[PDB]
Amino acid sequence: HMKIDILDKGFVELVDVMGNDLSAVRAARVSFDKDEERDRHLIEYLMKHGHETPFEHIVFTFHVKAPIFVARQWFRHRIASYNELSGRYSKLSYEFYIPSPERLEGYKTTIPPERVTEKISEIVDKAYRTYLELIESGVPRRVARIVLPLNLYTRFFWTVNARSLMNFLNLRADSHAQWEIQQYALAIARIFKEKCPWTFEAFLKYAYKGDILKEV
Amino acid sequence: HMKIDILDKGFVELVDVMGNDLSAVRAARVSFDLKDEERDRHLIEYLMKHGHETPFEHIVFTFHVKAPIFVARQWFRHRIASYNELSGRYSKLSYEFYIPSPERLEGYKTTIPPERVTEKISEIVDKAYRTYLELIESGVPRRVARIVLPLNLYTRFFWTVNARSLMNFLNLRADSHAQWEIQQYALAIARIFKEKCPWTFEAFLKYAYKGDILKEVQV
Amino acid sequence: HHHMKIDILDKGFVELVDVMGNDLSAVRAARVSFDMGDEERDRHLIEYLMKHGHETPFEHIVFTFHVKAPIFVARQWFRHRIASYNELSGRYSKLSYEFYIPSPERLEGYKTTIPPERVTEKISEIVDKAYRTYLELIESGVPRRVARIVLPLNLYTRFFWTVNARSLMNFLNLRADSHAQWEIQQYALAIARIFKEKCPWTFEAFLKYAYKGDILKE
Amino acid sequence: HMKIDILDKGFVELVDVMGNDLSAVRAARVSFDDEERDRHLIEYLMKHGHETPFEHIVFTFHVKAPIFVARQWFRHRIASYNELSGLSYEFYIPSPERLEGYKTTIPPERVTEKISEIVDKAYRTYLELIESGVPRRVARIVLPLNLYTRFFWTVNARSLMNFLNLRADSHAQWEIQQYALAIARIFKEKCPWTFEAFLKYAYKGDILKEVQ
Numbered sequence: 001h002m003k004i005d006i007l008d009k010g011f012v013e014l015v016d017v018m019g020n021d022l023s024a025v026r027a028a029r030v031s032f033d034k035d036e037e038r039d040r041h042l043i044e045y046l047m048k049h050g051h052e053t054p055f056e057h058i059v060f061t062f063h064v065k066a067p068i069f070v071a072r073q074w075f076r077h078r079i080a081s082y083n084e085l086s087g088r089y090s091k092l093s094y095e096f097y098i099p100s101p102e103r104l105e106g107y108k109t110t111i112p113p114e115r116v117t118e119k120i121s122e123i124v125d126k127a128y129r130t131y132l133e134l135i136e137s138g139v140p141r142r143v144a145r146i147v148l149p150l151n152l153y154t155r156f157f158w159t160v161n162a163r164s165l166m167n168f169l170n171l172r173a174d175s176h177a178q179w180e181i182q183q184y185a186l187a188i189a190r191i192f193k194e195k196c197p198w199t200f201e202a203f204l205k206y207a208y209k210g211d212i213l214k215e216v
Numbered sequence: 217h218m219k220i221d222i223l224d225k226g227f228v229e230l231v232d233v234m235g236n237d238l239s240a241v242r243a244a245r246v247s248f249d250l251k252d253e254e255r256d257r258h259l260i261e262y263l264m265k266h267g268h269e270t271p272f273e274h275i276v277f278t279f280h281v282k283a284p285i286f287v288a289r290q291w292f293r294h295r296i297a298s299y300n301e302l303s304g305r306y307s308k309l310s311y312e313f314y315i316p317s318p319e320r321l322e323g324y325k326t327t328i329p330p331e332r333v334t335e336k337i338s339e340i341v342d343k344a345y346r347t348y349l350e351l352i353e354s355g356v357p358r359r360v361a362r363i364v365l366p367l368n369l370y371t372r373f374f375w376t377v378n379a380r381s382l383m384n385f386l387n388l389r390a391d392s393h394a395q396w397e398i399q400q401y402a403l404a405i406a407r408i409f410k411e412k413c414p415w416t417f418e419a420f421l422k423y424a425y426k427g428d429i430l431k432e433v434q435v
Numbered sequence: 436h437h438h439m440k441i442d443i444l445d446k447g448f449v450e451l452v453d454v455m456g457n458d459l460s461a462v463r464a465a466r467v468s469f470d471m472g473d474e475e476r477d478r479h480l481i482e483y484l485m486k487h488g489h490e491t492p493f494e495h496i497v498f499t500f501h502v503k504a505p506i507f508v509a510r511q512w513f514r515h516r517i518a519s520y521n522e523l524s525g526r527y528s529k530l531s532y533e534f535y536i537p538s539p540e541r542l543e544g545y546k547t548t549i550p551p552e553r554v555t556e557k558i559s560e561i562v563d564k565a566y567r568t569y570l571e572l573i574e575s576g577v578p579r580r581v582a583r584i585v586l587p588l589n590l591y592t593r594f595f596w597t598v599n600a601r602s603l604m605n606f607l608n609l610r611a612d613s614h615a616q617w618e619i620q621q622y623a624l625a626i627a628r629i630f631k632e633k634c635p636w637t638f639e640a641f642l643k644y645a646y647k648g649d650i651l652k653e
Numbered sequence: 654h655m656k657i658d659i660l661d662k663g664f665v666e667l668v669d670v671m672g673n674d675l676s677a678v679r680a681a682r683v684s685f686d687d688e689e690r691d692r693h694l695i696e697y698l699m700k701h702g703h704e705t706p707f708e709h710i711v712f713t714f715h716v717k718a719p720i721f722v723a724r725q726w727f728r729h730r731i732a733s734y735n736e737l738s739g740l741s742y743e744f745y746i747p748s749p750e751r752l753e754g755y756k757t758t759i760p761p762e763r764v765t766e767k768i769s770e771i772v773d774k775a776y777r778t779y780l781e782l783i784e785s786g787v788p789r790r791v792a793r794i795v796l797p798l799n800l801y802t803r804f805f806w807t808v809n810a811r812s813l814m815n816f817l818n819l820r821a822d823s824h825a826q827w828e829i830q831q832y833a834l835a836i837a838r839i840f841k842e843k844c845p846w847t848f849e850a851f852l853k854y855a856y857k858g859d860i861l862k863e864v865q
């Protein structure tokens with residue numbers, strides 16, 4: 001019931017979550033068996049001192065639709081669990097990330113922004129037409145797809161604990177990461193903030209090393 | 217809800233769980249939806265049969281475990297998991313020790329009665345603890361004084377572990393090669409696992425589990 | 436001195452950069468000792484560890500590889516999380532643009548409605564068009580990080596991969612198999628070849644007791 | 654093998670090392686191919702948080718340490734461990750000077766003696782139980798936490814630096830601090846440039862900045 005559209009056809013969707021701020025408090029105290037302000041104080045204490053292991057007992061599963069070039073950076077985060085859509089279990093669709101002209105406003109190019117978009121669209125169509133021609137002629141899908149561009153969309157499930165999510169955000173929710181992964185990072189951050197507000201607030205306050213979460 | 221007493225003062229308690237069997241099915245398909253039970257059960261078996269283990273990483277457990285240090289050290293060898301042990305600058309410590317029952321000790325041919333061995337362990341534990349307390353009342357900080365305490369001191373921890381890594385744990389620990397004490401804990405972890413993810417556990421036993429005991433000892 | 440290089444596909448390769456240890460590193464680890472090789476007894480322990488799934492000692496043998504592979508290969512490769520990766524960026528060295536074009540013979544096998552040579556040619560033409568589009572966008576002032584999204588998945592990349600023998604055996608179980616894509620198998624055959632050269636007892640034990648694929652036995 | 658003695662019977666010893674500072678440089682450039690240029694890149698990587706190249710430097714240590722120390726140590730998950738299975742029996746007895754600092758009600762030499770006495774009683778009880786036919790992995794449970802153990806530890810430089818951030822610090826117990834200083838000494842000998850860069854840019858502990 002929480003879904004954020006990203007880019008032209010992408011999204012981040014929350015699938016499941018185990019626990020909440022109090023799950024890191026329980027883990028830190030090692031107690032299954034109310035005081036809101038002392039609980040927050042502890043969450044703040046854990047964050048400013050680098051006792052990050054309690055945040056490992058807060059887990060999220062997201063469903064992400066993202067271009068391959070985004071997914072390749074994302075998948076470098078080893079301390080998480082990934083499953084990528086494979087034709088073997090469910091149907092594949094072929095969709096592509098076409099940047100908006102606004103996205104290239106910033107840079108001062110020889111060719112109008114809209115012409116850049118159009119050239120990217122053109123390649124997508126030619127590459128996808130060639131892929132289909134190869135399929136129809138008997139080249140297996142696994143071989144034919146190597147002509148498709150890096151802006152082809154993929155989907156995956158990503159299960160990650162809050163600790164690893166904070167590291168993800170430190171590296172990706174930053175103005176040095178490419179813009180496409182920043183947008184996904186912002187969405188990940190919003191969901192995390194909704195489910196674990198005290199942890200998120202303590203994170204921004206003490207640990208967060210980036211910039212874009214302190215603006216937008 | 218779920219708590220199982222283990223040994224003389226130990227337990228395994230379920231704190232939380234994310235997902236169920238269908239969490240693995242949804243991860244393998246990569247969709248968050250048109251349920252079909254026979255279809256979804258076949259898929260679980262399929263995955264386990266052909267070693268496609270990764271979808272099982274999207275089921276996650278947190279357990280609260282009370283166990284002796286010698287058990288905890290064997291346990292903490294499982295690195296693909298999250299641990300938090302009671303310290304406690306955060307909460308209060310108490311001092312209880314595991315004393316094997318005479319029944320635990322019969323089967324061994326010893327030169328003295330099993331109960332005598334119980335008595336001797338109890339006595340040395342009592343002396344060690346008394347010395348500890350003695351050192352504390354003298355001004356010796358706890359972190360120093362505690363090094364005289366024996367390996368059968370109970371500790372507590374939270375353990376967050378996904379179902380794949382939990383299956384690896386059970387392969388190693390729910391098995392007659394493991395020490396009897398950690399076997400007991402692994403049987404309790406297996407019962408909770410089965411209760412929460414019955415189809416995966418059944419598929420695990422049928423296709424993947426390399427230990428002996430779970431296919432003999434119910435639950 | 437450790438150095439080996441095996442050429443893979445048209446332009447790819449797998450190059451051995453360094454190795455820590457040898458078969459006896461696993462024996463030393465298992466015994467917590469400095470034994471140096473009693474050969475009967477050390478080999479028997481290697482088989483023993485391998486047979487019974489006691490693989491932790493094999494973690495103390497470590498390889499660093501330099502791999503040049505198409506992006507579609509590197510993506511499946513990088514799914515192996517218990518390992519260390521560093522991929523070529525332009526911040527520290529020269530970026531090159533080369534692409535994997537399969538051969539006719541690779542495309543025989545399948546009963547295609549056009550000759551395999553024409554399939555190869557069609558792939559070359561669309562790759563060429565994408566690349567020229569990439570270069571035209573760069574010349575127009577488009578940042579490389581944006582322009583590059585039109586490049587296809589057969590673009591070669593390079594990376595360093597550091598990985599322990601245990602995780603490498605798991606890599607070979609999954610990738611050295613007649614179900615993996617052919618290009619994947621080729622790379623897994625080169626990794627295997629080096630592993631065998633450097634840890635022959637571990638490798639032979641792996642084949643006998645633990646190896647789950649089919650192509651390494653061939 | 655570089656071997657440093659720690660505590661009364663402990664040690665850290667280097668078993669093997671893969672690479673050196675240049676391994677991180679090669680990893681960063683992704684190339685199997687000028688000393689100050691290379692030192693500059695090391696500092697750059699560390700300064701800008703590009704730590705992954707330091708994962709391609711690997712060490713194997715042989716450590717003899719008390720169990721209370723080994724438990725803290727084994728908490729570091731991004732490493733490979735093999736512990737001695739089956740054995741010898743030695744115990745760490747804190748020196749008097751270790752126990753000076755706090756006002757105690759008895760002299761620190763007495764406290765040391767009290768530790769030693771209870772250690773001997775416990776070990777004596779362990780030996781009687783084995784003598785009686787009690788299996789060793791049951792009998793051993795009466796032995797105290799200051800029993801020494803031995804393990805091999807294979808760890809990369811990046812994870813080594815996280816371990817030093819946490820253990821080579823005034824907040825860790827004095828004993829693991831001693832082992833961390835020794836691990837640091839060896840790391841610095843084998844990777845002087847990575848280690849200097851680490852202190853100057855990434856290291857969040859205190860003691861390594863003033864304990865040479």
Ligand SMILES: Cc1cc2nc3c(=O)[nH]c(=O)nc-3n(C[C@H](O)[C@H](O)[C@H](O)COP(=O)(O)OP(=O)(O)OC[C@H]3O[C@@H](n4cnc5c(N)ncnc54)[C@H](O)[C@@H]3O)c2cc1C
Nearest residue numbers: 076077078079518521522524701702703705708731811812
């Ligand atoms: C300024 C900068 C420039 C970069 N340039 C490049 C480049 O050119 N090429 C390139 O490939 N990458 C580069 N990177 C790294 C790139 O960002 C990776 O995609 C990403 O950093 C992987 O992040 P991680 O290892 O922190 O996360 P994860 O893989 O999730 O690991 C999480 C944390 O666990 C620890 N960890 C996990 N596994 C290990 C392990 N095996 N050994 C030691 N510690 C471990 C680390 O401490 C890490 O902080 C660069 C990073 C930065 C910050």
Ligand SMILES: Cc1cc2nc3c(=O)[nH]c(=O)nc-3n(C[C@H](O)[C@H](O)[C@H](O)COP(=O)(O)OP(=O)(O)OC[C@H]3O[C@@H](n4cnc5c(N)ncnc54)[C@H](O)[C@@H]3O)c2cc1C
Nearest residue numbers: 053056079163164297300301303728729730731819824825
């Ligand atoms: C002064 C001090 C006081 C302490 N007090 C306590 C206490 O009260 N209770 C207690 O249990 N422990 C305590 N510890 C131990 C501490 O909590 C850590 O378990 C230990 O220091 C290992 O740290 P690590 O998790 O960074 O190292 P590793 O386990 O090697 O991990 C290294 C890096 O990998 C990443 N990583 C690895 N695995 C995961 C994962 N599963 N999820 C997310 N990220 C991961 C992290 O980013 C981390 O930086 C204490 C330690 C110190 C030094």
Ligand SMILES: Cc1cc2nc3c(=O)[nH]c(=O)nc-3n(C[C@H](O)[C@H](O)[C@H](O)COP(=O)(O)OP(=O)(O)OC[C@H]3O[C@@H](n4cnc5c(N)ncnc54)[C@H](O)[C@@H]3O)c2cc1C
Nearest residue numbers: 293294295296388393394491517601602732734735736738
């Ligand atoms: C009967 C028995 C006897 C034992 N005897 C000894 C002994 O004498 N000495 C001793 O030290 N220990 C001993 N152990 C502990 C044992 O060696 C393992 O450390 C423990 O069982 C954890 O198993 P694991 O590494 O598979 O689990 P985890 O550590 O959770 O790992 C799960 C899986 O993830 C992967 N993985 C995680 N980290 C790495 C890594 N760095 N490299 C490669 N793969 C990785 C592996 O594929 C592994 O199977 C014993 C255990 C048992 C059950």
